[PDB]
Amino acid sequence: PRLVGGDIPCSGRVEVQHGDTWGTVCDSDFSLEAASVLCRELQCGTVVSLLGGAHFGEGSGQIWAEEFQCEGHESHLSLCPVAPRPDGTCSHSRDVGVVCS
Incomplete structure (x- = not known):
């Protein structure tokens, strides 16, 4: 995984790689425990915190x-x-971000 758009490395928009491409993560879909795993x-x-509503900017792509x-x-x-997300897709306006300690 990576965090993008923060002013320091340990904060930013969550992006996680699948195959050759990167995907962002909808803020309806990402728990504190998943965030803890990412920060570790x-x-x-x-x-420390999940941040909603494209706080570091929205992503693009998957x-x-x-x-x-x-x-x-x-x-x-x-x-x-892993499990399926709820019915439908999110917009990138909902891409989740994190601040790690």
């Missing part, structure tokens, strides 16, 4: 169609169980 995986410590249903203690987002 990036060596940023722990989630938006993840599955939710990362993390328990919390996974070392990588890739080890979290």
